Amino acid sequence: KSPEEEHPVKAYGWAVKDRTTGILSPFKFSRRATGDNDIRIKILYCGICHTDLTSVKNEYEFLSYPLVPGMEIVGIATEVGSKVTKIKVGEKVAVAAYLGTCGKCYNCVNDLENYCPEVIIGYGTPYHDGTINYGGLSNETVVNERFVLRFPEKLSPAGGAPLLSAGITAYSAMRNHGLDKPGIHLGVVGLGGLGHLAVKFAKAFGVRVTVISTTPSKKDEAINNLGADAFLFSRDDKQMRAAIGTFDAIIDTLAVVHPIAPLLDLLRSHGKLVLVGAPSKPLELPTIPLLSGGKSLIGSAAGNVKQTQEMLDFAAEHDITANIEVIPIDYINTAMERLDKGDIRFRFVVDIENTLTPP
């Protein structure tokens, strides 16, 4: 069938129609009717993350096109299924970075569902009904209540949107591995959308933070704007040899290939290097440092919906928001170009309600 015929309820947004160019354009489609456990969401803001860019750059083999990207959604519940009681129509809600899970593995039943082997990602893949999921650059969406969050009333809807993928990924990796207790000297490699949010949460956790980066012109943003206690330029072997053995843990946010040996030397014995960015190619692990130091390489991806709701409540109390540029949807293609060059501090957020036009 056609996108507008495939489902009963009409919907519209922007979508990459030709995967070889990556250009989004207005797109008409449809969404399933509200099930008994479903929430219909009028989308207000949609953050743009690196996953969107990679998708747009035609580097995701499995994705179906036309592709409606966007997986950091903030909106309003317009309709709720018969069985839904946690949310009422008219309340502010947010969507998790994933839309569903098998529901029968250990992870799912113990509320660690983001690690389910059969996790359904925000968009580009089939749902439990076989139909491709359309993401957040659209006027409305429908999501199972389990994967819909309650948005704190005292949190900027626009500024809170990037928390739903970038935020949770940093929050969960820190909480789950004990990088949230005051006293720790924590390194954050890479000052991007993910990196800048790792710094904000650490400061609100009371953690000493050195921003590790290549770009030396980010020093001012790292210290003055973000609140980093120190800054390491990753070319000055004087700085490097001085910091050897000084870090209890390091969060690596880099999406690009990069050496690992220098980062392990920066750790004290039994220190942990947490990888949360998805490198394009595989990196090379230096066994000699890992073994002699007794160090750990640890991967982390997003977080469970219970963590996501707890993180959202923790950001209202401590006024944690992202540094965002709110853009109209027809600026998306220019924004993608700027994101490809790192020409953003630090997060695009599309205003869906006011800049998306029906037809």
Next chain:
Amino acid sequence: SPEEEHPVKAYGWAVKDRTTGILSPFKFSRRATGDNDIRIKILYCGICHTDLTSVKNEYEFLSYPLVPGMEIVGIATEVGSKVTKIKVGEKVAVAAYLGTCGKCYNCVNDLENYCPEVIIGYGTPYHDGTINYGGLSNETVVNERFVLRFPEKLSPAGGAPLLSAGITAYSAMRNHGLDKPGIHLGVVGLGGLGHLAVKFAKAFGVRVTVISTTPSKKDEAINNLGADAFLFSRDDKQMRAAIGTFDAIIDTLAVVHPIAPLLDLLRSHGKLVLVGAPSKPLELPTIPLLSGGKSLIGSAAGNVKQTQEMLDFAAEHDITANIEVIPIDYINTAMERLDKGDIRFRFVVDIENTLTPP
């Protein structure tokens, strides 16, 4: 000069030309017994892959002539004035390392094997600047801190490989909770380290699947060792069937090899423990690591308190290595066989009866 460097004469075998790797008879000397030192008459010295890598000229920092060997079992012949833990004439063993700085965090809390300035068994300077000579020699002198009491009821020959291979397996399991029944543990590589990892797991009551590329080890793994299962690491069907079934995996391989298949074998949040030291670097796929939320963990040997505790746990549960006792002048042939994995599972040199005086 080697014969003059210290007052007391000694002899062994050594690699004189680092470019060939051939050991030959070698005369040298050792320091006099300090106030806190124990002199050990060496009986048996295990041979590990570290020795082979050393003789294969893959450690640039090692000084030559190189006397290898770091799994020493012997007898204390004479002890310093202050030494009280050991009595002359009792069986002793040496740790895989010879000294530490003594004032970093690791040192002062008895985690000294992770000291940044740890002095390895041989080939690097001691606290007095002189190169250390390893266990393929007639006697050694070691600070009392790094000398262990060898249980009387334990084979000196079969116990020798515990001091590097054993402790490395023991500590990696104890430190990461791979010693409590309920765990499905994988052991990659059925060599000296791998086979001893299996024995300790059985005595811990842990379920052990041996993962190997050599299908001819299946019979020894299951019947002789006691492995609960055996997985051929190139049999895709077998591998794709075990996906997600392992709580942890101990990787003992000294050679470069893919890790992505080993990560799929782990359940979410599972741990891959590295105890083998490949010369070259491995290729780390981040997609499996991230999506599964898994961990890559390195481990090296263990502390002297653990090493003594491991030695006491092996006496009680009768854990020894499966060894071939060899004369010292067979060492060059033994290295060749070890390079091809033609051993089940550990060479042990008989120093007392086969080392000839100078």
